[model samples]
Target chain A: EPKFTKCRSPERETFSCHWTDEPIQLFYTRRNTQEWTQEWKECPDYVSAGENSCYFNSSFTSIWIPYCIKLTSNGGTVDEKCFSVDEIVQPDPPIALNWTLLNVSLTGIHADIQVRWEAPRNADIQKGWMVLEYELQYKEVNETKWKMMDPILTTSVPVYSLKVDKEYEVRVRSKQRNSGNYGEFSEVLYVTLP
Target chain B: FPTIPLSRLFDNAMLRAHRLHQLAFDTYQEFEEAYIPKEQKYSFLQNPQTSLCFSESIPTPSNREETQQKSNLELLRISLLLIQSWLEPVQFLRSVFANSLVYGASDSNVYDLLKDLEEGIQTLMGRLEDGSPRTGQIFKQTYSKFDDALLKNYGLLYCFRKDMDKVETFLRIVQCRSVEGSCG
Candidate 1:
């Protein structure tokens, strides 16, 4: 059975499902009534996401609704899975992850830093359809493990008392507040305390 | 769902404080080993007796029950104040060592730890008090009386190490009190 990997980018209002490369046809349907006895429809939009994936654009999708999808080859049905737009969502990492050193002391001992970011440009936050909670991570450039800051619903946070003259990196990620796993981490943002 | 529980937030802040305390000790030990003259090592490594701006020190509660009796907010305030006191001195020491003969004495890990601990305390303070700590200006002249730069650096490191020990001990006790409601 072929396994399907589903994702929803923070920068997109649509959802996509990818699969292993094999000669297969995508089939999908929704519950127009309480029963899912409706006829399965062949994927109308294919190869947009990739050669081995099904892409559902905004016109074909809505939130809190189910989309039953399956795949078939010459033999028979390979696998079947059912999911909704709200679940299986992994938004793209945040954008413009930036930091600034604040209030650097005269002798360079006491400095403050703040990390800031923006939601994926196409995310539905401004339109009020979806809510995202953010998590930020940082570490000295040479250190292997990243320290996760406390989760915040806001895009910016102030960090006090970082040491002077040390280079550090920070990143951010997001998730739909009420559902799904966190998306990918943003590109690492680097800074040297002044 | 919208926010972390106060207990967990305080717990996180306290644990960061513990980690930072350990880092401070490591930095002080390394610096003392490398820079402090062997003859003056044991003799000169005395506690600086630096007092907190808000209070002399946060004394241990009389007993385990007393420690558990205080609300989470009270504990947070204590942690914030203790961590806040170090920000000024630690920042000062970082600069002092950077410019003095003890250049590159401490590593970046110590500073990173301090950043985390300070940020955690500040966040908790803001949530609890609806504001942040109002820190006064730190003056170099107050502690620059010593003419010998090496002696000054040694004195600062010794006192800082001792102060961190106190912080670590207090936070450890509080951590236990928060979890088990009993710690001696």
Candidate 2:
């Protein structure tokens, strides 16, 4: 989730908001001050098909300084949108995955399955973020359409829906739930259903 | 009256929103009839009176005659309103906590989180009341509010979902916004 907030960039000095229109007003206010200071210039660079983050000079914004970016658009539908510079950071993706097939169930014509994965080895998640949610996807070996059932809260999930003795593929990815930032998906796990 | 591109886009989005709302109401009513028990889980669920026998027939599973589907849609809408007369889908989902829906998700906390999320979406809907300008006042407010509320609920969402990281984010956002609430 490339977001409309700050600290999302790896360099930490820049952040992106995902909206398209050029803001009518660009301002910032500090945690201690009531007055909002306005920036008189246009964004230095724009990416993501006119919807990416507005680039800024290194001297303008800092990774350590706590500031809120306020933007207002021309449409009456938009209010003052505020972005806190510190909280919205994107972490790296998980690095590895482990899986297993659980034994048979009584009701369904299938056996249970458990899948687990390790967080990314990169320093991104280790920077200041935690694994929020794991998006687990699975499909039959020959099937192209993957099932995105309910979200699993843990690194390991016991899934009950796969066919008995069928071969399947599973994968897991994560996102920071608040900052609306996302990491990459792990390598696929191939296993035979119990 | 001449229409501009921006309003045109809003119109398109609202049109989609209406369709999605209808689809949701249709699904809610269907889920109730097929799985939800007559009684409430918390006892507070019955505070609102829901109408009986919601039809999944309108938006037929696959294919149907247009007229038949139309009738189904009408009846479904009526039942949906009738249910709304007492409780909404999230509330209904809350009422069924610890019980089984068709898919039988195992966690009760997820349903609890869904109930709160429905409250936020319902708040957004009610705030609009079809007044798009009033809708405008809360744009960034509601957008971030939705995510804020979602993160809080899902952070504390399930027992396993609970952690200091999300809790910390929740506390910080709340702290910052309490000071900035008047600004937005």
Best by the lDDT measure? 1
Mind giving the per-residue lDDT tens digits that candidate 1 earns over A44-104? 7888988788887766664433567778876378876665454466777789888876778
| Tens-digit lDDT string for candidate 2 (B1-184) | 9543433333333233233333333334344456444333112121222110122111211111221222222322222222232232233334333344424332344334334333433433332243233322213221111113322222122111111122232222222222232112
How many clashes in each candidate? 2, 4
- Model 2 residue A144 lDDT? 76
Docking class of 2: incorrect
Predictions in order: chain A TM-score: 0.89, 0.53
Q: Please, what are the lDDT tens digits per residue for candidate 1 over residues B1-184?
A: 5887657765776566555654555555566667765446423322122111122334323222343454444545555555555555555566544543433344354566666776775566556542233332221111111116666655666555544444444454444434453221
Q: Which candidate comes out best when scored by DockQ?
A: 2
Measured with C-alpha atoms, the lDDT of residue B101 in candidate 2 is 42
lDDT of all predictions, in order shown? 0.59, 0.40
